[PDB]
Design a protein around this nucleic acid. Structure first.
Lengths: 98, 78, 48, 88, 93, 117, 92
DNA sequence: GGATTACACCCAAGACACCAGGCACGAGACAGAAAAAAACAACGAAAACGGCCACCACCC
RNA sequence: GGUGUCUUGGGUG
DNA sequence: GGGTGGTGGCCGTTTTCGTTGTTTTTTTCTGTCTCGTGCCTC
C-alpha cells in the first residue's frame, strides 16, 4: 500500500507532478505552501491559475492581456517579472465547469 | 531475384553444357529448376546452421548439405 | 561489455553532457555533477 | 527383429488385419534402414559440432534433414511428445 | 522405458543399439525415446495405408504387394523410399 | 474500472491455466490516526497540523481473484488519499460554528487546501 | 587455436611426382577436400565391415576390404599394394 | 540542438536507497549399478485366410 | 575550537 | 470367339496364444549441475 501513499504524499509535498524518479521532465510548482501571511493573500492564493509556458522563450504573446479575458480573469492582478501574464487570477464571479 | 538469372547467363551455362540452340521457353523453365535446387540445398544448410545455434551460414554448412544431397563439393573445406 | 562500461564511466566522470545517450545518474535520480558541469555556467568556477 | 513391435502397431491401426512373413521381413528392413539413416545423420551432426553426446535434439534435426514435409512435422511431433511423456 | 513413453517400440533396445552402433561416445536419455517414437510413427503410417490396400484386395493378411502399393501411391513415403526395392512388391499399374 | 482485470497465463504441454483478479468498488473512510501502540481514533486538522501529520483517508479496493483451468482477496488497503479541508470527506464538514470553535478551527477559514506533514 | 590440413603432405607428394611443379591455394583446398572425403568413405566402410562381423577392432584387413569395395579395378589393386607394403614394412 | 534567455538579495518546503541480479553457500534435480520379478523370443496347436477348382456371365 | 549540499514555488530592488 | 469379370465349395498353411528359457529395468546412497537465498552497491 505504501506505493500510492508515498506517491501522493511526495507529489503534494514537493509539487513535482509525476513519479519520484522522473522529477526532471515533470511539472514543478503544481502544489505550493498556502500563503497565510494575511487573509486576502490566502483568498487570492486559493484562486490562482498558471500557464506552463516557461521562461525559455521571449514570445510576449501568451503573456498579454487579451480581449477574451473579460469577466473571466482579473485584468490587474498578475505577478511582476518572469511570471507576468502567465499566472492569472480568477474574477470574483468566475467559475470552472465540472 | 530469380529474374536476376538472366537469359544471357542461362545461355552461357547451356553453352558450357554443349547446347547449340535454345527454345524460348527454356529460360523460365531453368529458373524454376534452379530455384528448386537452391531451395533444397539452402534449406538443409540453414538446418545445420540452426542446429549449431549460429546466425551465420558457413561454407561447411553448405558443403554438408550438398554432401547429404549427394552433391559432394570440393574446395571449400578450408 | 565491461571495457565499454569502463569507457562510459571514464567519459561521464569528465563530461556528463554527451549528446545522444543517457546520463550517468545518481541514487536520487539527479545526474552526476561532472567536472565540465563544475567548470561551466553562471555558477561554474570561471564566472561563479 | 522388430517383428513383435510391428505386430503390436499393426493391431493398433488394424485390429483384424494380419501380415505375411515376407511383408514382416520388409517392415524389419524398413525399420533398420530408417534407424541407420537417422542415427548416422545424428552422429555426423554431433561430430560437426564437436559434441560427444547424441541427444534428442540431434535426433530431431536429423529427422528434419531426412524426412520430407508432413512426415517430418508429424514425426517431430511424435518424438517430442514421447520425450515429454517419458520425462513426466 | 516404452510404457512410460507411451510407445510400442522398444526404448531400451533402441538405446542399446545407439550405444553399440559406434555413433557417439555418449547417448542422451531422450534420444532413444525420440527415435523409437519416430520409427513407430512411420511404421504406423505405412501399416495404415498397407492395411487399407489389403481391405481393397479382400485379404486380411498384408503382403509385400500391399506395402508397395501403399508406399508408391503416397508422395512423401515414395520420396522417403525412392532408392528402395521392395521384394515381391512389383510396380504400380 | 479503466483497466479492471489482470491475467496470467501458461499453456505449455496440456492445460490452460489463467490466474486473474478483478478490481471492484472503492471504499472511502473518514481520516483516522494510528499510534505506535496500535490504538486508533479520529484525526482532526489541528492535530495533524501540530504533530506534522498528513491528513488523509484510507482507500480500500475489493479484489476478487479467479482461476480457470480448461484441459485443451478482501478489502485490500491500497493507500491513503489526502483530504481537502471543508470538502465532503473532511471531518470539519459537519460541526457547526460552536463545535468548530471547540475543535480549534477558525470559522473564517474556508478550506480548499491539504495537510501534508 | 591450432588449425590443421593435409597441405604439407600433399605438397611433399607433389614434389615427389613433379619436382618443378607448384599448386594454387584453391587446388590445394580441393586436394584437402579429396583426402578428407576418401578418408570418410574408407573409414566408414571399414566401420560397417567390423560391425557386420561382430568385431570391435578396425584392422588393416577392414581397411583393405573397404579399399576393394570403394575403389575401381586397377586403382584398387595399386592402392592395396601400397597399403600392404606400408604395413609389412612398418611392422618389421 | 553543446548553449540559454540581466545582476545582487530575501525565506518558505522537499531527497537525503533507484534497482535488481553481482558473488558465494545450501537445498532440489541428474548420472552412476544389479539382482529379481517382468518383457522378448521360442515349442506346439488352432480354425481362419488365401489359391484352386466345379461351375458362371459379358464385349469389340 | 570547529554552525553541510541541490532543486520547486512565492516576493523585494 | 478368346479372353476377362463373377459364385460357391474344398484344400493348403499359418502366425498368435498357452507357457517358459533367456534377457532384462531400476531404488537407494553418493558424487555433479542448477536455482533459492543472504550481504552489499549559428
Amino acid at each position: 500500500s505504501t506505493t500510492i501513499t508515498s506517491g501522493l504524499k511526495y507529489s503534494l509535498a514537493t509539487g513535482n507532478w509525476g513519479e519520484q524518479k522522473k522529477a526532471m521532465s515533470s511539472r514543478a510548482g503544481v502544489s505550493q505552501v498556502l500563503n497565510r501571511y494575511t487573509y486576502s493573500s490566502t483568498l487570492s492564493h486559493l484562486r490562482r491559475t498558471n500557464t506552463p509556458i516557461g521562461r525559455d522563450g521571449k514570445l510576449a504573446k501568451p503573456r498579454q492581456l487579451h480581449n477574451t479575458h473579460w469577466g473571466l480573469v482579473c485584468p490587474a492582478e498578475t505577478p511582476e517579472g518572469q511570471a507576468c501574464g502567465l499566472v492569472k487570477n480568477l474574477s470574483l464571479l468566475s467559475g470552472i465547469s465540472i | 531475384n530469380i529474374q536476376g538469372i538472366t537469359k544471357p547467363a542461362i545461355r552461357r551455362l547451356a553453352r558450357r553444357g554443349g547446347v547449340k540452340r535454345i527454345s524460348g521457353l527454356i529460360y523460365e523453365e531453368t529458373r524454376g529448376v534452379l530455384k528448386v535446387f537452391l531451395e533444397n540445398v539452402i534449406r538443409d544448410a540453414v538446418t545445420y546452421t540452426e542446429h549449431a545455434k549460429r546466425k551465420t551460414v558457413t561454407a561447411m554448412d553448405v558443403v554438408y548439405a550438398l554432401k547429404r544431397q549427394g552433391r559432394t563439393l570440393y574446395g571449400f573445406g578450408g | 561489455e565491461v571495457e565499454q562500461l569502463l569507457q562510459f564511466h571514464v567519459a561521464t566522470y569528465m563530461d556528463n553532457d554527451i549528446a545522444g545517450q543517457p546520463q550517468a545518474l545518481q541514487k536520487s535520480g539527479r545526474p552526476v555533477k561532472a567536472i565540465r558541469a563544475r567548470l561551466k555556467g553562471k555558477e561554474g568556477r570561471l564566472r561563479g | 527383429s522388430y517383428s513383435i513391435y510391428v505386430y503390436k502397431v499393426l493391431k493398433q491401426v488394424h485390429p483384424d488385419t494380419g501380415i505375411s512373413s515376407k511383408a514382416m521381413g520388409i517392415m524389419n528392413s524398413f525399420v533398420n534402414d530408417i534407424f541407420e539413416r537417422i542415427a548416422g545423420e545424428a552422429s555426423r551432426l554431433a561430430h560437426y559440432n564437436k559434441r560427444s553426446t547424441i541427444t534428442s535434439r540431434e535426433i530431431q534435426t536429423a529427422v528434419r534433414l531426412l524426412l520430407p514435409g508432413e512426415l517430418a512435422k508429424h514425426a517431430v511431433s511424435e518424438g517430442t511428445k514421447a520425450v515429454t511423456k517419458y520425462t513426466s | 522405458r516404452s510404457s512410460r513413453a507411451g510407445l510400442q517400440f522398444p526404448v531400451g533396445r533402441v538405446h542399446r543399439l545407439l550405444r553399440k552402433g559406434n555413433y557417439s561416445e555418449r547417448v542422451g536419455a531422450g534420444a532413444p525415446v525420440y527415435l523409437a517414437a519416430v520409427l513407430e510413427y512411420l511404421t504406423a503410417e505405412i501399416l495404415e495405408l498397407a492395411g487399407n490396400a489389403a481391405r481393397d484386395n479382400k485379404k486380411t493378411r498384408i503382403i509385400p504387394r500391399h506395402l508397395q502399393l501403399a508406399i508408391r501411391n503416397d508422395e512423401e513415403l515414395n520420396k522417403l523410399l525412392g532408392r528402395v526395392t521392395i521384394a515381391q512388391g512389383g510396380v504400380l499399374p | 474500472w479503466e483497466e479492471p482485470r489482470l491475467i496470467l497465463d501458461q499453456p505449455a504441454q496440456n492445460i490452460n491455466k489463467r490466474y486473474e483478479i478483478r478490481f471492484g468498488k472503492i471504499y472511502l473512510s473518514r481520516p483516522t490516526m494510528t499510534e505506535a501502540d496500535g490504538t486508533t481514533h479520529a484525526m482532526f486538522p489541528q492535530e495533524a497540523r501540530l504533530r506534522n501529520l498528513t491528513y488523509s483517508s484510507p482507500v480500500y479496493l475489493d479484489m476478487e481473484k479467479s482461476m480457470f483451468t480448461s484441459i485443451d482477496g478482501n478489502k485490500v488497503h491500497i493507500g491513503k488519499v489526502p483530504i481537502m479541508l471543508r470538502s465532503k470527506f473532511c471531518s470539519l464538514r459537519t460541526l457547526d460554528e460552536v463545535d468548530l470553535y471547540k475543535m480549534k478551527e477558525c470559522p473564517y477559514d474556508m478550506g480548499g487546501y491539504f495537510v501534508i506533514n
